[PDB]
Amino acid sequence: EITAISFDEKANLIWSGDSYGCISSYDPTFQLYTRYRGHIGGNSVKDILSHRDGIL
Amino acid sequence: FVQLHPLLPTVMIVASSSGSFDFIDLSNPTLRTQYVHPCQSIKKLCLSPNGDVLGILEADNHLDTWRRSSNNMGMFTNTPEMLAYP
Amino acid sequence: SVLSRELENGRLFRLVNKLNCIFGRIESRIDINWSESGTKFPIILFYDYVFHQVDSNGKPIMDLTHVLRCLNKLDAGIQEKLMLVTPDELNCIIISYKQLKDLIESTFRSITQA
Amino acid sequence: ENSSASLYVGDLEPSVSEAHLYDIFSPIGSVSSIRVCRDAITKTSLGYAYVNFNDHEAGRKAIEQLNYTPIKGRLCRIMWSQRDPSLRKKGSGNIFIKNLHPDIDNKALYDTFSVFGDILSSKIATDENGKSKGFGFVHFEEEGAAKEAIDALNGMLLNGQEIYV
Numbered sequence: 199e200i201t202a203i204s205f206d207e208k209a210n211l212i213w214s215g216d217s218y219g220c221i222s223s224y225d226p227t228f229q230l231y232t233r234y235r236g237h238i239g240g241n242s243v244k245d246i247l248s249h250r251d252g253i254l
Numbered sequence: 255f256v257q258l259h260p261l262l263p264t265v266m267i268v269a270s271s272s273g274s275f276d277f278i279d280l281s282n283p284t285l286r287t288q289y290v291h292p293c294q295s296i297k298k299l300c301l302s303p304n305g306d307v308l309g310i311l312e313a314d315n316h317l318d319t320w321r322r323s324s325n326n327m328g329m330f331t332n333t334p335e336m337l338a339y340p
Numbered sequence: 341s342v343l344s345r346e347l348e349n350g351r352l353f354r355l356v357n358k359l360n361c362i363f364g365r366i367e368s369r370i371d372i373n374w375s376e377s378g379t380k381f382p383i384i385l386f387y388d389y390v391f392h393q394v395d396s397n398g399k400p401i402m403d404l405t406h407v408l409r410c411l412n413k414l415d416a417g418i419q420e421k422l423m424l425v426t427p428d429e430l431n432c433i434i435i436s437y438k439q440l441k442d443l444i445e446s447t448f449r450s451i452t453q454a
Numbered sequence: 455e456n457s458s459a460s461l462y463v464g465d466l467e468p469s470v471s472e473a474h475l476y477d478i479f480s481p482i483g484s485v486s487s488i489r490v491c492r493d494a495i496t497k498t499s500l501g502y503a504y505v506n507f508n509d510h511e512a513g514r515k516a517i518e519q520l521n522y523t524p525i526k527g528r529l530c531r532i533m534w535s536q537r538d539p540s541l542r543k544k545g546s547g548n549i550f551i552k553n554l555h556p557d558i559d560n561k562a563l564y565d566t567f568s569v570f571g572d573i574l575s576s577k578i579a580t581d582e583n584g585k586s587k588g589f590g591f592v593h594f595e596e597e598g599a600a601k602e603a604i605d606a607l608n609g610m611l612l613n614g615q616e617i618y619v
Binding site for chain 3: 219220222232233234235236
């Protein structure tokens with residue numbers, strides 16, 4: 199259901215959005231770090247990007 | 255899927271829907287590295303600021319990197335604010 | 341000699357004054373800056389996290405030791421790391437205290453006048 | 455200034471990219487950022503590069519592993535970074551030589567000649583399978599280490615060829 203992907207420039211995390219509502223960060227090869235929402239509802243996310251300070 | 259390299263902002267990677275990806279020059283198109291994909295077609299793929307990380311990602315949540323084994327590391331950097339212990 | 345073990349109320353009661361002074365105001369019960377996409381979102385979340393911490397059977401059981409432990413810690417303003425869940429996989433934020441202090445006093449002052 | 459790498463290749467090419475460049479010093483570790491900033495109507499050589507690493511010590515480490523070996527005729531030049539208060543930093547001139555010895559390289563040149571005077575740019579005409587072309591430009595930070603190397607031995611006799619001012 200994964201619908202948007204980006205990195206972070208400062209860690210080994212992955213930043214994924216499924217089709218459930220969420221946005222998650224991921225450790226190396228098979229481990230998650232966080233999964234939060236900044237999303238209202240419906241589908242999760244159009245797109246994801248990295249930044250100097252955080253994740254948009 | 256056409257994406258310029260981060261450290262090499264003219265050299266790109268070009269990849270199809272099934273995954274015929276090629277590390278390819280901008281200037282000399284003869285210098286192609288046509289890495290085939292012996293697996294299923296893709297949704298998306300991402301990059302390597304450390305230059306040695308293939309991330310193929312479908313809806314399966316199973317990554318694999320194909321490059322030579324320069325590092326035992328995954329991504330670029332190693333400063334996590336809750337690194338292995340909150 | 342007996343009044344020695346009674347004094348830890350007034351700071352605590354002012355903490356509850358600041359706490360339940362603005363928690364569920366009817367204009368702010370349903371609005372933009374208090375949803376999961378809203379601004380002051382986890383100030384709700386930790387709030388009842390203490391107050392409805394489920395057991396191994398899922399029963400929200402107090403264990404007021406842990407409650408007042410957390411209460412003095414949040415009252416302090418020190419820098420910690422805090423796991424938080426819905427229970428399920430959403431809105432998890434690992435945070436410290438002094439920014440929570442700052443948003444609390446900011447919201448209180450904004451409520452107090454403009 | 456320039457406490458970091460700032461590793462400055464000059465005397466550039468029109469139409470050879472940084473591809474094989476990054477191919478060669480791949481296994482060294484610290485390769486931070488490589489870029490030639492450019493003009494707008496300009497697909498010819500202009501004359502400033504930035505093979506930037508993290509610190510200066512990574513540049514010296516890149517020297518100390520292996521440096522100045524011939525591939526594609528180009529040799530990577532070192533950090534200069536020297537602007538309008540440097541009217542004569544590397545422009546305080548050089549000995550210009552007619553009839554250098556025809557085996558004069560740059561590496562053994564500065565190796566034996568690190569004693570008297572520090573050579574900045576040994577702009578030496580070496581071509582066609584190990585032959586210094588007689589004319590060269592041994593270049594310094596001043597014109598004092600130049601006179602030091604001249605008054606020591608302005609060249610010497612190893613196969614007899616003294617060099618020129």
